[PDB]
Amino acid sequence: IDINTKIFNSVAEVFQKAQGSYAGHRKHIAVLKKIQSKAVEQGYEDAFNFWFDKLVTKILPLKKNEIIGDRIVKLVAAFIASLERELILAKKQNYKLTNDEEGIFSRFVDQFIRHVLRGVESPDKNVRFRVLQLLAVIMDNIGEIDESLFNLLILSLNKRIYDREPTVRIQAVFCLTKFQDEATRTLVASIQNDPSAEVRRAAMLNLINDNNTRPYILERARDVNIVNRRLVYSRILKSMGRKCFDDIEPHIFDQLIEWGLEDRELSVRNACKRLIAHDWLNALDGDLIELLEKLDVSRSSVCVKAIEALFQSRPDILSKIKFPESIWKDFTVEIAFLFRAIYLYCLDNNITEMLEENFPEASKLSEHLNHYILLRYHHNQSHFDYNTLEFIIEQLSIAAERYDYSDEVGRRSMLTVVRNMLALTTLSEPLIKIGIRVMKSLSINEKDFVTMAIEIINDIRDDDIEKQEEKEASSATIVLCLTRSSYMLELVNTPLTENILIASLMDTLITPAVRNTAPNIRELGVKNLGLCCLLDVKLAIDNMYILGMCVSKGNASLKYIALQVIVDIFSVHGNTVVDGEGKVDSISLHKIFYKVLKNNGLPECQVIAAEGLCKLFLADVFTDDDLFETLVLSYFSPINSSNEALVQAFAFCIPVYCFSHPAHQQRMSRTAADILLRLCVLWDDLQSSVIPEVDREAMLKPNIIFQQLLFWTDPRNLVNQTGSTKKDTVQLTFLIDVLKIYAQIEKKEIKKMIITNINAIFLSSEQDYSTLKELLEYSDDIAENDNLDNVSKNALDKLRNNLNSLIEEINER
Amino acid sequence: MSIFEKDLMAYFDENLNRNWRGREHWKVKKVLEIDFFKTDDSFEDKVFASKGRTKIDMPIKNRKNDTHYLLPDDFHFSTDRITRLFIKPGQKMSLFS
DNA sequence: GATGTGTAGCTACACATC
DNA sequence: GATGTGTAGCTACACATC
């Protein structure tokens, strides 16, 4: 027998059995090195390299996940690796293996790669996949290579990164990740611009994660793929451990935790909650205080969310928290926050044991609370101190708002602390807000709470007038009184006639505040004015008109606040404030809603105009279709597609309105027909026109919009099923209205778009008999008196057929 | 009050959590073997055929995306943010009544 | 476009071992 | 405690096929 043929039989034997199982992979590796060693001693080195390649070519056309391929691939990888390993431990100390095995490997690996690179651009998707698959696994164990082959690998890969199939694109990055120490650039481009989420993921996990690439990696925390948003917290932030607090900037850091704790998916939240509680706490040795220094508390907003999840994860450490007795000399923003967090936690879940001894008495807290007020406001990094003190004061105050005040000495003690705190003329707004909140909790009744507040307001007012004794407080003072009044009025919930002091206050500055020339003072005047209008109806009517002028001619800030007032006046009083003797006509106000909604220059004002109108239509205080029609148009319109806040508002409000009550859905059906028409014209106008900036794709395609309107009008989606709502004809009448409109459109494609999706209808035997007949008479009319598109013809013929069969069903007594 | 309003409040939030973008994002054996001994090797060249007509590449339209496939800013429009008044968050109106 | 089957990640719990 | 292994179930996203 020939030597060459013998070599072929030996290697072929190995591959033939290795394909069957992983059982003898170790032996096979040893056999191959033996076959190789015997071939190189006889001079037939090239004969081994030749055959070996031919057999790895037999497995390439196999699909992905084909069980046979994997086994051979693993073997080939283990063979290369085992050879490399023999070569490393030698170089560590022992040298030089006199049988030229370093050259044999360099000569073998170089020759092997160039063989599998003949199927890198094959038409077959499976060949391209497994070629890239072989390279990724053997990449680490190549060792040294000639320069030319290095250029041929990056050349082939930088093209395969943009390959048609996602699978081969994944294997591409795996092969590029081993080159990172130009390769980085390409992976940063693929993690952002690749459509397949699994390529973004692959580029995310295996990226270098140095200082320059870290931002793109943490970017995926808001990746549209759920999995890619979960692993960034799980895999990447566990791999960094404490490197987050050291290498990641706080402003980016505070954002990450924010996204994770309130993500819409249950899976992503647990990945972030567990990360903070389990991993970071254990990584920080259980120091709950040091953990709060990481999660900055003075400048963050979700620490409340993080501390809850922690208490849920570790209820055992919960009991060991000690607020050591009367050592509050050193009270850090972490501790002060800790206090608020723990106290409000026990109240929410009724941790009865703690509320007894683990917390100071009402009067004993007033000692510490006041202790920081003098230290801040009375007597003289200074601003750091100022902020921290206000922060501490804030935390204790929020907890003080909800304390047990069966004790009377404690209540009266604290009361004297807030009253001398609220009277301060340099109290920052965050403390003003909570101060009123606490004083509201102390008062025995409403009138009490009002009186005390009013007194503090007038005192600060009068203290400046009598100092000048031109009888009007300084513009500043006017601000302080008004902000204090709003927070009070937000808590008052009874008519004005029963509290005479409100009217007196309102007569003094709430009114001159409206007539002021300063924006901020004006805005505040309207704010307080609105809060009073919710209490006295006649006061609202007398002020309906004045508000309408500020929403028309007022600057953005004033126009912003003024509109909100009008929405709430309606929420509580309904239509009693319009259309009547001395009452403004609703038509004028509908015209003001139009202007705000239409206005493209001020987005936020659109949002409240949209959000408000939905609330009103929900409560059935508004029922004008021509307005409700304009409301839905602003959702799909291409001019409002750029306002992110505006889209989501309608996404939530329109479904709830249609599904809340039959009448609300009916209203959609009656007008939704004309809606689709106006949008069809808008899409056509948008598509055909050529104007340097277009983004004709900035709007939905009429086929999608059609499905949308069919969804909302679908009577199956009514939340309250009376059992007899399945005979509702709302969607039929809608479609009938569209068919009468079908003749006004002129473009084939659009007409196809409408027709193709008409079979999402819901037809039932209990539905009326004459309405289906009508719909059938319009459907067949269009089908057999117009030239159709084979696609549109079959789908339409189908709809016709659905009826016909249906008419027999109902036609039978 | 609010037996009916809390009832429906609970329903919509849980049901409409993936529709928050609300913009076109609204869902609603053989153990075959290879005989490495046989010499059907002229198929080897079938593996290395040139692409020819088959595109096996991505259109340049998809090779770059400006959205970067990131979520849009979440305003967390929930049934709570709608029930509460604007200037008086404490109080709320009785829509769904 | 619309399909059915696939598959990637989990998630969860019972454990058995160290 | 800490850890495996074992099965089972699940959801979004792939592919396959027509």
Residue numbers in the entry:
A (entry chain A): 7 to 187, 205 to 403, 410 to 498, 567 to 910
B (entry chain B): 383 to 410, 456 to 524
Please give me the paper's original passages concerning this structure:
Here, we identify a direct DNA-binding site in the eukaryotic condensin complex, which is formed by its Ycg1Cnd3 HEAT-repeat and Brn1Cnd2 kleisin subunits. A peptide loop of the kleisin subunit encircles the bound DNA and, like a safety belt, prevents its dissociation.
Even in the co-crystal structures of Sc Ycg1–Brn1 with DNA, 43 residues of the linker that connects the α1 and α2 segments of Brn1 remained disordered. The trajectories of the visible residues that flank the linker, however, indicate that the path of the connecting peptide leads over the bound DNA helix. Since the length of this linker is considerably shorter in most other species, we shortened the linker of Sc Brn1 by 27 residues to match the linker length of the human NCAPH kleisin subunit and co-crystallized the new construct with DNA. The structure of this construct very closely resembles the previous Sc Ycg1–Brn1–DNA structures. Furthermore, addition of BMOE created a crosslink of the Brn1 loop and resulted in the formation of an SDS-resistant complex with circular DNA substrates even in the context of the Ct Ycs4–Ycg1–Brn1 ternary complex.
